[PDB]
Amino acid sequence: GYVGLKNQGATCYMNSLLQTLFFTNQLRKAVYMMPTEGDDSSKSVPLALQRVFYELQHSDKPVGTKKLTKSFGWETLDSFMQHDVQELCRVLLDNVENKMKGTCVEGTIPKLFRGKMVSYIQCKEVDYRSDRREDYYDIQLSIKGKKNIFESFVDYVAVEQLDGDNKYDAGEHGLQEAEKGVKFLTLPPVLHLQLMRFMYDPQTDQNIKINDRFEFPEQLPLDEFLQKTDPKDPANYILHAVLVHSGDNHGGHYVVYLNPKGDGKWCKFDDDVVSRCTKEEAIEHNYGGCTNAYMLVYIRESKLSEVLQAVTDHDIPQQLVERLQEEKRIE
């Protein structure tokens, strides 16, 4: 009982991303609460996301995204093909985060998608170490040479040797050999994991896809990679969405698989057609080695009910509904 999105232009991963964001129910409810009463529909990306989500909720007919593409200004043909799926997510989520500022749902975007990370550079020779902390909304994981997501996280937190021609400048201590590393402090309730499915060559300016077999589990234990573990909230995550690209280059066939209720009931979202699908077609058939996954969405098991909370028609403000209904009448 889920409606799809019209193909329209070459939106690439956008339709796959929109369904993923739409079925993050906690995000959707906060999006409806955004005060777009005074926003002009031309350049209002927060309002356009409300229109897309509202149609995805109350339309049997396929849902259009023409106004949304105009909202964040990706109207040229190559705009999506010159960009990335995580870059599009930032544009949408940053705009709604600013909109929610000063409201009851302020901080919803950082609460759901933001985690805490530590990056360190410890000089081996002298007693020097820097311990910068950086927040992240998404994680890009390496699939080349890695068999499963566990090895990608192992390589992610693996130490890098800053020796030879790439030593670390310690200033007063001087140029010395050091190790560079990254550790995870916190993991967000909604975990966006993008896979490095393409390798780029600066010399020849060519993009080569990595269709090698990369495994992702239905349930993902990540307590090991945390710097400090926490009892009563282990870092165990459940697979929610699998964004898949079947082509051999940028542009092609972008399709996303979801189990919106977290029940394991998987459906295939291919633009206009939303067909029920097998768990087999969702997880393992997209391991690769044409179709293979480029992005994965995991939800922490503790936050499963809250993130995927039931959304009713009463949740959408009547003002917004009437404003959207009025525009449909004028058409």
Partner: peptide, 14 residues
């Protein structure tokens, strides 16, 4: 974007 010893992308553009 750069990582380890090479440049990569998801969906394939750089």
């Amino acid at each position: 974007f750069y990582y380890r010893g090479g440049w990569y992308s998801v969906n394939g553009y750089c």
